[PDB]
């Protein structure tokens, strides 16, 4: 159904070590398609998915110019923010930026966002209406006034509602073979005795795309979120995701417990039950 394009940018200052680190990455849903790294040899926007490789030298020359203008903006911003907070030149600081657009199952514009963080905290965000800003503190109000005076919101909104959704549609068509896929989790349950009175049940979800999933244990149809050991969804490294959830049960009572799997790739949610 719904799809997204997102760009992520990090800038880290290097006290007494010259130019800041800069890393830019682009995603369609959970699939990285481009990157730029200041530490890499090319100093170009590079492809990271097969379907973007077919874009011509005009695309690559244009993305290179625009990523370097982002780099230059972040370069100035780290100096400006050190000024705004009167921080010493001795310490490393971080700017993070994320922007992008969501489309619905009709591939029509659903929402756009632009967030900016200084040292791991909200600094300024575009509001849902894409017409104004929320500034976290007194320093960010300075930025907010500069962006109002220069009508950034109007030109950012034209990108998020226009260009962003048009190129997302182009990429979805050019990448159909891999971007439009939903891979349902391959699921199984393991059972390991801990003692003569207790046992661990572990519910596995493997080879799923996208990353969004719910794994939940119920006892007699009632949630067990107090006693569930849960790992964070993790990349397999081949474009799919893995997750597991475990519960410690009394021996002889395994059949009271059900593992519930919800995923976009499933016609309907799975219930799994241990049977010897």
């Amino acid at each position: 159904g719904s799809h997204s394009m997102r760009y992520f940018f990090t800038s880290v200052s290097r006290p007494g070590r010259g130019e800041p680190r800069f890393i830019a990455v682009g995603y369609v849903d959970d699939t990285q398609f481009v990157r730029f790294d200041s530490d890499a040899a090319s100093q170009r926007m590079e492809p990271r998915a097969p379907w973007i490789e077919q874009e011509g030298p005009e695309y690559w020359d244009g993305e290179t110019r625009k990523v370097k203008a982002h780099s230059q903006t972040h370069r100035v911003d780290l100096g400006t923010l050190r000024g705004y907070y009167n921080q010493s030149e001795a310490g490393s600081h971080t700017v993070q930026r994320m922007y992008g657009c969501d489309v619905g199952s009709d591939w029509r514009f659903l929402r756009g966002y632009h967030q900016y963080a200084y040292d791991g905290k909200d600094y300024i965000a575009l509001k849902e209406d894409l017409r104004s800003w929320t500034a976290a503190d007194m320093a960010a109000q300075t930025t907010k006034h500069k962006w109002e005076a220069a009508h950034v919101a109007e030109q950012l909104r034209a990108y998020l509602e226009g260009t962003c959704v048009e190129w997302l549609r182009r990429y979805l068509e050019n990448g159909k073979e891999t971007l439009q896929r939903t891979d349902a989790p391959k699921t199984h349950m393991t059972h390991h005795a801990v003692s003569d009175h207790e046992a661990t049940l572990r519910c596995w979800a493997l080879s799923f795309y996208p990353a969004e999933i719910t794994l939940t244990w119920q006892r007699d149809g009632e949630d067990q979120t107090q006693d569930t050991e849960l790992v964070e969804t993790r990349p397999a490294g081949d474009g799919t995701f893995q997750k597991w959830a475990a519960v410690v049960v009394p021996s002889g009572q395994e059949q009271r417990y059900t593992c519930h799997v919800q995923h976009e790739g499933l016609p309907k949610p799975l219930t799994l039950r241990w049977e010897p």
Binding site: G26, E63, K66, T80, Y84, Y99, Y123, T163
Partner: peptide, 9 residues
């Protein structure tokens, strides 16, 4: 495709 309009804070 990148936004071409980012502005200094």
């Amino acid at each position: 495709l990148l936004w071409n309009g980012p502005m200094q804070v």
